[PDB]
Design a binder for these strands. Structure first.
Lengths: 119, 74, 182, 138, 181, 81
RNA sequence: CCCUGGUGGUUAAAGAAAAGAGGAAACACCUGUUAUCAUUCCGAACACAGAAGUUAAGCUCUUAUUCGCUGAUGGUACUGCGAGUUCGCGGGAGAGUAGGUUAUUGCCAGGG
């Protein structure tokens, strides 16, 4: 009850502070946010001048058939990079979205980095 | 038995310097205050002493959200 | 091998079933379980005697198996002549396998070795399934040796349970065989 | 006497008191009330003089409620001084009353005896008064 | 039955100055709301109101007739100036004339009780009773004579002799209204 | 966790001298003696004189000696006057 | 498209409490601490590795509005001005009363 509620509350507070520390995204340099469920892994690129998701990816996508490991998110970030290049976006701001930059997120981010995306 | 007190500081001239709807250019001071009596919205910045100033030319506007006042340049 | 405490085995293989039947719970893990055991000791006299606090911390380490933390003064007070931030208490948290093993050790071995041990008041419940009670002579635990103690000391034990009421936790403790004075 | 037992500040500025009463203007705890017809200050000590009058007139018949409490210092400079130093010192306590304040309330006794007792009280206050029955019960 | 009827006519002034002028013409501004209708703004004759309802309680119910309609209204509020005995606004809450409704009604104690005569102790446990009736038949106050009530006697709620179409509503019927111990 | 501030926990078999029950319990106490538990596993054996089932509280209850029968004891000798 | 999840926009609480309903997918609970990682002790949180079990809680929806929040129409206070004087013109609360309220919506992903 109260313990789960306060865990949620802490997550929200962290999320909000992160958001206004990094600022909003613009069509030139939109914002990349992630979400880490118990099963999957989601990423969205958002332009807040419109509230529009320019691109997105997740491990639910059957064709990718990745898992939920460091290796899998490496490949997933590769796919995201190749999907964004054809929509000619190279600058992104990395909203860690209430998580700690470590492990899976670290591998995701570095994978977007080796392939010419400025985060 | 004289007066034990009688001591006052110099008035600091706080308050809103540009009224909502006025046209300002970059760098104008909008509010002088102690503390965020008014908070910062789009296109404004907060000085080290909570002064509100305009980052770009535009028109001042005040909004209210959950009872807090926000200053913006639109 | 995932080595498992015998208490965990006993719980998982019987107690879940008996409590489901006995409290007609609809879904299985509506069953109560244990989340943490907090062992606390408050040495206010440590403000004079650092040796007291050091001895308490060390003896807690031998008793449980993991190191303790010395809490500080929340508020500076004069009745006990307390200055805010001074080291006043020491506590240990036990969770999971260590928690189960320590509770087994306690119930079967240390509660027996208490002078005039006639059970434990089966009413020290905070109304929300948390059972807190004291032990005055740590020497009941055979882990610590008698010679090295610098002053006989006691300590409080709080057991935190997922139960929503006292009845559930008392039933779980009785199934565990906790010697309540009844 | 009647006086507050603790104050934030010992001396306060004499306002201008005006207008009728918009609150504390209805009979609440009793049967008969002593409304005022002016706006002025009633000292604590006149308050207790009126209270003695009412209570003594009433031979245990009923109860008396006092609907005002002074809580306002009244300062006065020493006897022989000039206009120099400032804000001399508290002397006695005043309560504020406006046209329509109930000011006094009585319970238990017959209406005639109450009216007599409460004229006896009004004889000692500095404001015009009016004795009112509930005007919505009998 | 007339003594429960009240004549009004509509007003369209709606100002502080306008209301003062009306009261100078010796009338009373008033509003009627309830039953989800649009509020009706009207004015009343002060002399008529004083003559008829000089003793109005929260439970008084009456009839408003604008010459063209009838309304059953409670006196929800009346803004009275005590010093000048001056009414200066009335709020009328309308109810449905044929819908049973509840209302706490005060008691009025009469007679000298034998028990208290002989050494009984008044304890007025209940100052009011929840009754039930159609609006036009609600009792203004329910009477109770204590004269036969001897020592060590409590008053049952059923013991209250009640007007014709008025009925008890208390969940606890056996609670005591006044005791004499 | 970090690992440098913990006494060495060890699986230990506690043997009651009275009832013979043995308890498997991870105690930091190093026992000089070793015992083969039922599970064919070697564990430091610590012999403890008092245990759970041999409570003087669970099983052997209080012996109320000469409290209520005071009348009986006085009757049996000093009653023949 | 609808459901679910994520992420915004518009501000009146879009607030908590209790009761009932579900859970395909999705979300969460949940499982182990062994690898990197974290706690002034604790795998609780954080972190990594996963699919045995469940709506129990979180979550969504439905309830008497139970608490809160919001709240008219009239009237009053107050007030600018006035050769009408407790009056003439204009502005108009707070409290209370009748009520109301358990949000709405943009585009991304999964499958209906």
């Amino acid at each position: 009850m109260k313990k789960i509620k306060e865990a949620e509350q802490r997550k929200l507070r962290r999320k909000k502070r992160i958001k206004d520390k990094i600022g909003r995204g613009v069509a030139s340099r939109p914002r990349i946010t992630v979400f880490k469920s118990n099963r999957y892994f989601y990423a969205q690129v958002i332009d807040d001048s419109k509230g529009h998701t320019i691109a997105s990816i997740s491990t639910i996508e059957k064709s990718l058939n990745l898992g939920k490991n460091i290796d899998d998110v490496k490949k997933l970030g590769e796919v995201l990079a190749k999907r964004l290049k054809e929509k000619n976006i190279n600058n992104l701001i990395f909203d860690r979205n209430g998580y700690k930059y470590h492990g899976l997120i670290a591998s995701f981010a570095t994978s977007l980095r080796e392939f010419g995306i400025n985060i | 038995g004289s007066s034990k007190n009688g001591r006052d500081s110099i008035s600091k001239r706080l308050g809103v310097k540009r009224s909502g709807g006025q046209f300002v250019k970059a760098g104008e001071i909008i509010v002088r205050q102690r503390g965020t009596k008014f908070h910062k919205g789009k296109n404004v910045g907060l000085g080290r002493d909570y002064t509100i100033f305009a980052l770009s030319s535009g028109k001042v506007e005040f909004k209210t959200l959950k009872g807090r006042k926000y200053v913006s340049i639109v | 091998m995932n080595y498992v405490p015998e208490l965990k085995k006993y719980y998982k293989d019987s107690v879940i079933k008996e409590l489901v039947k006995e409290f007609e719970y609809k879904s299985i893990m509506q069953v109560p379980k244990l989340e943490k055991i907090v062992i606390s000791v408050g040495v206010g006299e440590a403000v004079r005697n650092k040796k007291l606090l050091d001895s308490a911390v060390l003896e807690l380490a031998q008793i449980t198996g993991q190191k303790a933390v010395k809490t500080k003064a929340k508020k500076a007070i004069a009745g006990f002549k307390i200055r805010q931030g001074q080291e006043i208490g020491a506590k240990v948290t036990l969770r999971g396998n260590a928690m189960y093993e320590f509770l087994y050790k306690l119930i079967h071995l240390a509660l027996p070795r208490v002078k005039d041990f006639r059970g434990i008041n089966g009413d020290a419940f905070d109304g929300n399934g948390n059972y807190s009670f004291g032990i005055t002579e740590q020497i009941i635990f055979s882990e610590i040796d008698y010679d090295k103690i610098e002053r006989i000391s006691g300590l409080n034990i709080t057991i935190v349970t997922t139960a929503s009421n006292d009845k559930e936790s008392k039933a779980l403790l009785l199934k565990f065989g906790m010697p309540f004075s009844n | 006497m009647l006086s507050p037992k603790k104050v934030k500040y010992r001396k306060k500025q004499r306002g201008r008191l005006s207008g009728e009463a918009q609150k504390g203007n209805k009979i609440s705890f009793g049967e008969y009330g002593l409304v005022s017809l002016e706006t002025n200050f009633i000292t604590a000590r006149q308050i207790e003089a009126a209270r003695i009058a009412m209570t003594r007139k009433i031979k245990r018949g009923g109860r008396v409620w006092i609907r005002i409490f002074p809580d306002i210092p009244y300062t006065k400079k020493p006897a022989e001084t000039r206009m120099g130093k400032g804000k001399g010192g508290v002397d006695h306590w005043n309560a504020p009353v406006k046209l329509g304040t109930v000011m006094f309330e009585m319970s238990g006794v017959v209406e005639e005896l109450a009216q007599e007792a409460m004229s006896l009280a009004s004889s000692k206050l500095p404001v015009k008064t009016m004795f009112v029955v509930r005007r919505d019960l009998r | 039955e007339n003594s429960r009827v009240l004549s009004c006519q509509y007003r369209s002034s709606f100002g502080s100055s306008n209301a003062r002028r009306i009261r100078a013409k010796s009338e009373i501004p008033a509003v009627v709301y309830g039953q989800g209708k649009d509020v009706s703004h009207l004015r009343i004759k002060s002399s008529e109101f004083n003559k008829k309802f000089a003793k109005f309680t929260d439970n008084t119910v009456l009839i408003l007739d604008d010459g063209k309609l009838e309304r059953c209204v409670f006196v929800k509020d009346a803004a009275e100036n005590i010093a000048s005995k001056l009414i200066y606004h009335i709020d009328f809450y309308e109810v449905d004339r044929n819908v049973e409704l509840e209302k706490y009604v005060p008691i009025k104690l009469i007679g000298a009780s034998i028990g208290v005569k002989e050494g009984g102790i008044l304890t007025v446990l209940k100052e009011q009773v929840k009754v039930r009736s159609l609006p036009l038949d609600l009792p203004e106050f329910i009477e109770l004579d204590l004269t036969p009530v001897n020592k060590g006697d409590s008053v049952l709620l059923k013991d209250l002799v009640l007007p014709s179409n008025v009925r008890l509503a208390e969940n606890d019927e056996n609670l005591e209204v006044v005791i004499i111990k | 966790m970090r690992k440098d501030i913990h006494p060495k926990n060890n699986l230990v078999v506690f043997k009651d001298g009275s009832n013979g029950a043995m308890f498997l319990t991870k105690s930091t106490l190093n026992s000089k003696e070793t015992i083969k538990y039922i599970d064919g596993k070697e564990y430091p054996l610590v012999t403890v004189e008092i245990t759970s089932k041999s409570h003087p509280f669970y099983t052997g209850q209080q012996k109320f000696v000469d409290a209520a029968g005071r009348i009986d004891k006085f009757n049996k000798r000093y009653k023949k006057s």
